[PDB]
Amino acid sequence: QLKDNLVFSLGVESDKIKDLSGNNTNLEVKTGVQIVDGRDSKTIRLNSNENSSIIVQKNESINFSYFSDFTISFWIRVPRLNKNDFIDLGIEYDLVNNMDNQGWKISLKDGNLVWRMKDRFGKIIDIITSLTFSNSFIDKYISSNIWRHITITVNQLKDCTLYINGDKIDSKSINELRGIDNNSPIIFKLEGNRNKNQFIRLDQFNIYQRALNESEVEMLFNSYFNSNILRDFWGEPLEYNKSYYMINQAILGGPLRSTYKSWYGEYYPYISRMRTFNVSSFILIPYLYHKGSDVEKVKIINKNNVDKYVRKNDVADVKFENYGNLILTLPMYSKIKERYMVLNEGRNGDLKLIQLQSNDKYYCQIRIFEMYRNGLLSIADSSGWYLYSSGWYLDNYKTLDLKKHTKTNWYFVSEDEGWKE
C-alpha cells in the first residue's frame, strides 16, 4: 500500500514510456531516448546526446514545497567504471535535474551517486556516496553495471536519508534548509559528462508524497523480487538456452575451464586462478568474459521449461557449449566414487537451481541429487579448484561460515555493453 502515496512512476508499458502511477503526468520523451531490455521487461536508456532526454512538467501532486515530505526511488544501471570515465574524474554530472536557482538533483561523480538539495538562500545539503570498487563492487558500488535500487527520503525540517538495495547508506540533517520548490521541470538527461560513451538505464523512477521510514524502504525494495525467477549477475531474469559465463562467488575473476584427465575417461571442469585487470594502478577489476581464452561457456537447459525464465527449484542441466553435448554431472559411482564433477554426455543424477537466501540475491545455489553423493555444488578448497558435490554443505547449510556460503553461490554472466574488458 506504498501505492497510496505514489504520485509519479516513470517506466515502460506496451512499448511506450509513461507515468505508470495512474496520474497521467505529462512527459516529453525526446527521440534520442531508447527502450531496451531491462531487469523486468523493458527499461529506459539515456545516451550522451542532446536528443536523449525526458522533461516532466511538475504539477500540484509532484511538489517539493517546504511543507511536503517526499521519497524518490529508482532502479539504475550505470556502466562499470572504465578508462573513458576518467575524463570526468572529480566532475559531478547530472542524471536527473530539478535545480534552477534552488531545488534538487541526482548526479554521478567518480563512480558514486550524488543527491543534492539547495534552498532559496543558497543553503546546500548533499549526500555523496563514498563506495570503493574493492570493498563494495558486488553488493553496492554504483559504476558496476549491476542493477541498483536507490531510495532517497526527505523529511523536511528533519533529515534526508539515502538507501541502496533497501539498506540505509547515509543521512543528513536538513533542519537548516528552507524551501527547494521551483517552477522548473524535472529533466532526465546526462548533462556535464565529457565521456560521451556514457549511457544509463533507468526504471521505476518513483516519487511518493511521504518520507518512507527505514522499514518501508526495505519493504519497497523487497516488492521488486516477489516472483520465483532466479537472476543473472547483473540482476536481470536468469534464462534458459542463453550463453553464460559461470562464476563462483569466492573467485569472481576465476574462469571456468575444463581438463581431460587421460587416466580416467573424464573431462573435469575447474575454476582457474583469479584474473584481473587494472583500470588505474589503485583499482583491480575481475575479468568476467576472458576473451581470447579457453573459458567454458554454458547454457542452462530444461526440456520441461514453461517459458524462457529459470525459476527457483527448476530441474535443469548445465550444458558446456564448447563441447556441444556434454553436461555437468557426476561420474558413475562404480568407476569413480568421489564427489568431483565431470563433463559427460550421460546424465547421472539431477541438478536443481535453488535460492536458499532471499529472492533479491543475484546468485543461486545448485543442488546435486544423486544416489550416493547428494550435495551443494561447490569448489574443492592454488592453481585452480575442481567442482564437487558437498554433502556437508548441504546438510549444514544453515550454519555455514561466510567462506563456505561464498563457495556455494554461483553467478551466470552474459556480455553487456556496460561492462567492457
Residue numbers in the entry: 834 to 1214, 1221 to 1260
Sentences from the paper on this structure:
Here we analyze by comparative genomics Pb mosquitocidal and non-mosquitocidal strains and show that the active component in Pbm responsible for Anopheles toxicity is a complex that contains a clostridial neurotoxin (CNT) that has high selectivity to anopheline mosquitoes, acquired through a megaplasmid. We found a second toxin locus (ptox) flanked by insertion sequences and transposon elements. This locus encodes a protein, which we named paraclostridial mosquitocidal protein 1 (PMP1), with high similarity to CNTs, a group that includes the tetanus neurotoxin (TeNT) and botulinum neurotoxins (BoNTs). PMP1’s closest relative is BoNT/X from C. botulinum strain 111 (36% identity), followed by BoNT/En, the Enterococcus BoNT-like protein7,9 (34% identity). PMP1 presents the conserved SxWY motif in the binding domain (HC), which in BoNTs is involved in ganglioside receptor binding (Supplemenatry Fig. 1C), as well as the conserved disulfide bond that links the toxin heavy and light chains, and is essential for toxicity.
To analyze if the SxWY motif is involved in toxicity and to determine the presence of other cell recognition regions, recombinant PMP1 HC was crystallized (residues 825–1260) and its structure determined at 1.95 Å resolution. PMP1 HC includes two subdomains, a N-terminal lectin-like fold (HCN) consisting primarily of 15 β-strands arranged in a jelly-roll fold and a C-terminal β-trefoil fold mostly composed of seven pairs of β-strands linked by loops (HCC). The HCC is the main region associated with cell recognition, and in PMP1, presents the most structural variation compared to other CNTs. Of particular interest are the three extended loops found almost in parallel in the HCC subdomain. A fourth loop composed of residues 1213–1222 (loop 4) was disordered, but seems to occupy a different position compared to the equivalent loops in BoNT/B and TeNT that are more protuberant. Remarkably, W1231A and W1224A mutations of the tandem SxWY motifs did not decrease toxicity. Instead, a similar motif, SWYG, located in loop 1 of the HC C terminus is critical, with an important role for the tryptophan in this loop. In addition, the mutant affecting a surface-exposed tyrosine hydrophobic patch (Y1100D/Y1101D/Y1173A/Y1227A) also nearly abolished toxicity.
